Amino acid sequence: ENLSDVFDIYAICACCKVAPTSAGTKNEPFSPRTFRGLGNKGTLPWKCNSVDMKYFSSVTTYVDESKYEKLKWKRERYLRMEAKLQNVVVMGRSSWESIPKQYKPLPNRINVVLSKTLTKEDVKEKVFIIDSIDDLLLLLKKLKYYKCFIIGGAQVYRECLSRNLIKQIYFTRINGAYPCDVFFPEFDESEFRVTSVSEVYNSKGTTLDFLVYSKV
């Protein structure tokens, strides 16, 4: 069976173009993947993009009650053989720490932070602290939710793609070049097909679009 399908594990990210460097061995002016920039110095490479922000918020928050029973059954079945509704959002520690206190935990979604060092003692926000992907799966198996969104960062995307635990990738392309030090991990793209390509959008002069890739 495909766990990414049974537990509806999707990834959502936004990547921009990478700003060249005149020094160092990391300049890739000819990179085969134009949009691969994820972060810089612990924060996003670009300045507040309200357009992607709204998009991100809608995707990760939207739930359809009518479609849940079907998911409930699909899961009850898998679990059988193995033996307010909200989506889950999963993020690495650095990502969680990069979010300003006032915006955490992300409202209307069940928050999960992956970390082997954070403790419930110092993390007062309502969030599940998970020690590993393995434990993440243990959590989803005993949790009522709609879809599970992996929202970052690079390390977390890598682990999930590497384990073939991603069913869909919601990929925002930011058409701007900014300095970057964290990039989207490479994986076998032949395993996916683009299933949604939005019209172009504009943020203060910078264009961007939204793509969705679904596993074959």
Ligand SMILES: NC(=O)C1=CN([C@@H]2O[C@H](COP(=O)(O)OP(=O)(O)OC[C@H]3O[C@@H](n4cnc5c(N)ncnc54)[C@H](OP(=O)(O)O)[C@@H]3O)[C@@H](O)[C@H]2O)C=CC1
């Ligand atoms: N453009 C985009 O869409 C996104 C950009 N970002 C950007 O990416 C950068 C942060 O990403 P990155 O550096 O990859 O870090 P992450 O945000 O993934 O956090 C890394 C930390 O998460 C924890 N972690 C990772 N995997 C596991 C695991 N399997 N089990 C338990 N804990 C785990 C560890 O915490 P610990 O050390 O406590 O164990 C780890 O050091 C920032 O610059 C941020 O702004 C982040 C998300 C999305």
Ligand SMILES: CCc1nc(N)nc(N)c1-c1ccc(Cl)cc1
């Ligand atoms: C709004 C930015 C954004 N847009 C998209 N399309 N995907 C994401 N995963 C994020 C994101 C970045 C950093 C953190 Cl910490 C959490 C989420």
